[PDB]
């Protein structure tokens, strides 16, 4: 997360972290409910075996609100492929349930129609993660959050060097030095409506971080709703 603020107490409770053997965060996720985590399919490749961590805001000083959960089964979308990064989405079924407490709570899944017309037509959305605070620096120790304006679907395609599929959308800034970065992928893209937040996207990819002229590419959640429900019933 280049630029942006720090997630203060309880501000980003639906945030999740995928940790590897080394116990280091390599990707993000979004807590959907006590048993399921939302993430990007391409993150399932960046690690041998992994577990997820909730209620963690500082990777250094142990916070009693933390918990580690093992994965029971990963539902990765078949249509996904690294060449196009299309269908960059996946749902995780946890072995033990998540104890919702402060800094640990689920994000609401919206209705498809309502979201596309009310949620994604809002000016901004919020993205967060423990990823790099710079294109070359190292993984962040603190959980950050960034207000990212929605990007006109057209500008998105023009600025982009790759095929922006209908399963993706742009968010970020053209010049301002703010956008997600490595390690942030898989994280939550949420939109705010009357103090209640809704999952809207999955930190997917970009051509670098906060590059002038480029934007952050996010998996369009509203385009996989029915798929997510199916997954929460496992399939």
């Amino acid at each position: 997360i280049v630029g942006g603020q720090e997630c203060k107490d309880g501000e980003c409770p639906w945030q999740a972290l995928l940790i590897n053997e080394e116990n280091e965060g390599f990707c993000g996720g979004t807590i959907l409910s006590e048993f399921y985590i939302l993430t990007a399919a391409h993150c399932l490749y960046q690690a041998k075996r992994f577990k997820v961590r909730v209620g963690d805001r500082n990777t250094e000083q142990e916070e009693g609100g933390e918990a580690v959960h093992e994965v029971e089964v990963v539902i990765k979308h078949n249509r996904f492929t690294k060449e196009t990064y299309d269908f960059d989405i996946a749902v995780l079924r946890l072995k033990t349930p998540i104890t919702f407490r402060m800094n640990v709570a689920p994000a609401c899944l919206p209705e498809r129609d309502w979201a596309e017309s009310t949620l994604m037509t809002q000016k901004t959305g919020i993205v967060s993660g423990f990823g790099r605070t710079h294109e070359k620096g190292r993984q962040s120790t603190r959980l950050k959050m960034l207000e990212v304006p929605y990007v006109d679907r057209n500008s998105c395609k023009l600025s982009s060097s790759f095929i922006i599929t209908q399963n993706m959308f742009c968010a970020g800034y053209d010049t301002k030095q703010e956008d997600a970065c490595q390690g942030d992928s898989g994280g939550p893209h949420v939109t705010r409506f009357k103090d209640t937040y809704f999952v809207t996207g999955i930190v997917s990819w970009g051509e670098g971080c906060a590059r002038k002229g480029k934007y952050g590419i996010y998996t369009k959640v509203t385009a996989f709703l029915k798929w997510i429900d199916r997954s929460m019933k496992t399939r």
Partner: protein, 51 residues
Amino acid sequence: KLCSLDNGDCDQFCHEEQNSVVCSCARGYTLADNGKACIPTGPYPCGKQTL
């Protein structure tokens, strides 16, 4: 009517079924008596910051 006005005065989901407005809520919430407001049925309802 007109979920476009101001979301039809709903708290969350807004549907225009028939001629009128029709509000609803995310899982974990129950529609209020006024059929507009959404009410949490648990200590940690989705989309709410634990402040």
